[PDB]
Design a protein around this ligand. Structure first.
Ligand SMILES: N[C@@H](CC(=O)O)C(=O)O
Ligand SMILES: N[C@@H](CC(=O)O)C(=O)O
Lengths: 143, 142
């Protein structure tokens, strides 16, 4: 520990980082799945793969595993605002990604491309970037 | 308060940003190639050329962050060990840049055939190894 339980803040950032990266690979997988889905316009797309969609399911499960860990460890009262905003945000992005797997799972390319996914993602990154600031800024104080 | 721990955190944020932007580049490229398969009226929604262009941009910013990282160094043995991160980054960056020209030149065969995921994994580990060595090994050793 030390700097306001430095190790703690170090572990939470590790969990959030892995959760974040894992949600990004989930989106990559969906996308690679979608691009390969041959059912568009004047083109046969590419090697029809649903394994990639299955992968998406797995990575989202893994990201959910890490967040579950971030949520069950020594919660600091000062990080209460930052942590909740991280929750307004994670639940929305995780639900966005699942609306997507559900669309690719039923051939609903109507809804898949139309979903404003990037906005949901940015909002989480903002929340995550904010958690990082709070954990250091004026939080590195007292030692 | 130490020069070592402080420069280690600074480097962690530069790498995190690089990694994120390279992941963001891959996502932008993929969304373009998907939109490139049907080409259903390119516009605000079907921002295919626009996603290809954003991919060029996020990759350029990744490059910049790495610049800051390589533009500094006080740690001895660490760097020696972590020439691994540079190798893996050198590799993955070229992979992303090549996918941009394949997509740009409409070479879909080449875009899908490239073993991108293998190169990104290699980098993610190099990064996790950097953190392994930074943590304790230096975070305690000064
Ligand atoms: N809207 C979805 C699918 C797509 O546009 O390719 C996304 O942002 O991933
Ligand atoms: N090989 C490229 C394109 C694709 O396979 O979707 C990638 O893995 O990003």
């Amino acid at each position: 520990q030390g700097f306001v339980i430095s190790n703690e803040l170090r572990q939470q950032q590790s969990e959030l980082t892995s959760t974040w990266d894992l949600m990004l690979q989930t989106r990559i997988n969906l996308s690679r799945s979608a691009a390969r889905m041959m059912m568009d316009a004047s083109n046969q797309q590419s090697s029809a793969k649903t394994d990639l969609l299955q992968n998406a399911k797995t990575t989202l499960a893994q990201a959910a595993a890490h967040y579950a860990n971030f949520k069950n460890m020594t919660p600091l009262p000062a990080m209460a605002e930052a942590s909740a905003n991280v929750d307004e945000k994670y639940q929305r992005y995780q639900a966005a990604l699942a609306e997507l797997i559900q669309f690719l799972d039923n051939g609903n390319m109507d809804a898949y491309f139309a979903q404003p996914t990037q906005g949901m993602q940015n909002a989480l990154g903002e929340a995550l970037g904010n958690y990082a600031r709070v954990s250091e800024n004026l939080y590195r104080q007292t030692f």
